[PDB]
């Protein structure tokens with residue numbers, strides 16, 4: 403029947419009223435998907451009927467996610483276990499994931515290195531690992547994924563934090579890695595716009611989320627209201643499906659009222675006339 | 685209100701000081717009568733800067749040549765600079781890895797080198813300098829860019845490294861405030877500057893007015909001396925009207941009522 407079927411989900415209003423059917427049959431990669439928000443995203447995509455490839459270091463926990471994804475109604479579900487500290491693994495994982503699904507529509511970059519709250523003193527090893535895992539691997543994954551994403555006019559979804567937009571104590575190395583994601587991905591988004599690379603980039607700015615690891619890490623130090631992981635995961639997916647540049651998800655209504663930087667948007671528009679990129683794209 | 689006398693007899697480190705803005709900062713400090721230790725890879729060009737600093741009126745001037753790609757050099761450089769001067773009042777972090785304008789395709793080696801040189805070495809230099817800066821109630825001056833506050837095409841890796849500096853240094857500034865570490869942190873947000881390397885790199889690509897390097901260097905020094913959190917220096921008056929993020933300042937204040945750090949500092 404699929405051979406005799408054709409058409410498009412993305413008509414009038416698909417910019418921007420989300421429908422779960424926008425993900426039906428989509429080929430999606432989810433990193434850091436054995437637990438937390440990543441696992442919740444895998445589950446939502448499964449229910450939507452997407453093809454899913456999940457990653458994390460633990461094959462046993464990834465197996466459980468895959469099995470549950472198949473139960474939920476995933477078109478297909480696979481896992482490839484490995485560390486995002488290993489740039490060769492990051493690069494080969496994408497080729498292997500694309501081969502399993504026959505392409506790629508959405509790349510969800512969610513994994514981070516294990517981090518606890520502490521004052522910065524002399525842990526350079528954690529600053530470097532944070533930059534390698536939380537930032538550099540996202541770039542390596544993007545490079546490996548781009549040819550397939552260009553072919554499908556796909557999407558890159560980057561999971562960040564409010565600590566990737568404002569300063570927050572006790573998470574300096576982590577904040578540095580999240581700010582780096584904004585600088586990198588927002589700059590290449592301008593490059594893609596002028597180069598006519600029809601690959602959307604969604605930066606997801608999340609507040610505190612009720613994941614097991616975050617609740618343990620912040621216990622007794624951060625007393626703010628945590629937001630539910632299930633709804634968080636859905637808002638990330640929605641943002642990527644609607645090709646939104648930025649997603650904001652937090653418990654506080656004051657955050658939503660204040661995080662947006664209209665001055666940055668205006669400045670970027672003003673500076674867009676300061677350059678002549680003709681030699682780079684012809 | 686700044687006075688050149690605020691730098692008289694001050695012990696100052698200037699990185700990336702053999703050329704451009706860094707060299708201009710060394711010269712201003714020399715005229716102000718500061719003790720100066722300059723760094724970059726080229727000993728021959730550093731020798732010229734030191735010699736000119738002494739002519740301009742520096743209380744003392746030294747150089748130590750090396751690469752900021754080498755974290756051990758970054759760490760040992762601070763100890764030696766401090767040994768030469770008998771302490772440290774101001775740490776000016778200015779050096780960057782050589783960068784040209786290009787679309788990002790697959791140059792992961794440049795993204796990593798940018799992060800290592802432009803960001804990681806600044807952190808290593810700060811760790812090595814902190815005990816001396818705590819002793820003098822000193823200052824850390826971080827040289828960034830408008831590309832470290834807003835997105836700009838052709839400088840993705842560079843922009844990522846400048847954004848990282850904001851996240852890192854602005855977070856430790858909050859930590860220092862609660863830890864009662866009396867070391868100021870000045871983030872300098874610069875627009876296009878008429879340095880020889882920038883003018884060559886942007887030739888035919890970027891046509892916006894470049895601001896003078898001499899005045900840029902002075903504004904950086906002023907900001908550090910006044911212990912300002914952020915310095916904004918650009919040719920355009922519309923930049924000055926728009927770069928500031930008062931909402932970020934408000935949000936940071938609103939979120940500080942949500943955490944308790946008195947378990948890490950007592």
Ligand SMILES: NC(=O)c1ccc[n+]([C@@H]2O[C@H](COP(=O)([O-])OP(=O)(O)OC[C@H]3O[C@@H](n4cnc5c(N)ncnc54)[C@H](OP(=O)(O)O)[C@@H]3O)[C@@H](O)[C@H]2O)c1
Nearest residue numbers: 434435436438439458459460485486563610611613615616
């Ligand atoms: N939770 C919050 O309050 C909060 C707030 C703001 C932003 N965020 C963002 O939300 C995203 C997900 O966070 P979360 O709280 O859901 O995290 P999480 O539950 O702790 O899960 C992190 C995931 O990454 C994997 N991972 C860890 N180290 C890895 C490595 N070296 N290589 C590959 N995968 C690795 C973990 O599995 P394995 O250990 O088996 O590898 C796991 O699947 C992150 O980008 C985080 O910054 C979360």
Ligand SMILES: NC(=O)c1ccc[n+]([C@@H]2O[C@H](COP(=O)([O-])OP(=O)(O)OC[C@H]3O[C@@H](n4cnc5c(N)ncnc54)[C@H](OP(=O)(O)O)[C@@H]3O)[C@@H](O)[C@H]2O)c1
Nearest residue numbers: 700702703704705724725726751752778829877879881882
């Ligand atoms: N110029 C602009 O338009 C502009 C705009 C915004 C912000 N800024 C910021 O201003 C600062 C200074 O820029 P500039 O234009 O003055 O640059 P510059 O003239 O090109 O000088 C860069 C300096 O860093 C040194 N350096 C390069 N690679 C190094 C390495 N591996 N290890 C140690 N030192 C190294 C160079 O010396 P050696 O090669 O001999 O080592 C030189 O002294 C930078 O932080 C830059 O981001 C500049």
Ligand SMILES: O[C@]12CC[C@](c3nnc4c(Oc5ccccc5F)cccn43)(CC1)C2
Nearest residue numbers: 517563564565570573609610615616619939
């Ligand atoms: O793996 C983890 C290590 C840190 C982590 C984490 N990710 N983002 C954050 C954060 O951002 C915030 C910044 C400003 C206001 C509210 C926030 F929420 C504040 C505190 C912890 N945050 C919690 C557990 C991610």
Ligand SMILES: O[C@]12CC[C@](c3nnc4c(Oc5ccccc5F)cccn43)(CC1)C2
Nearest residue numbers: 673783829830831836839875876881882885
């Ligand atoms: O060493 C160099 C490599 C890039 C370099 C450089 N440093 N900052 C920038 C920049 O920021 C800007 C961002 C937005 C508006 C105006 C700007 F100015 C725009 C273009 C080049 N920029 C020019 C030569 C630094």
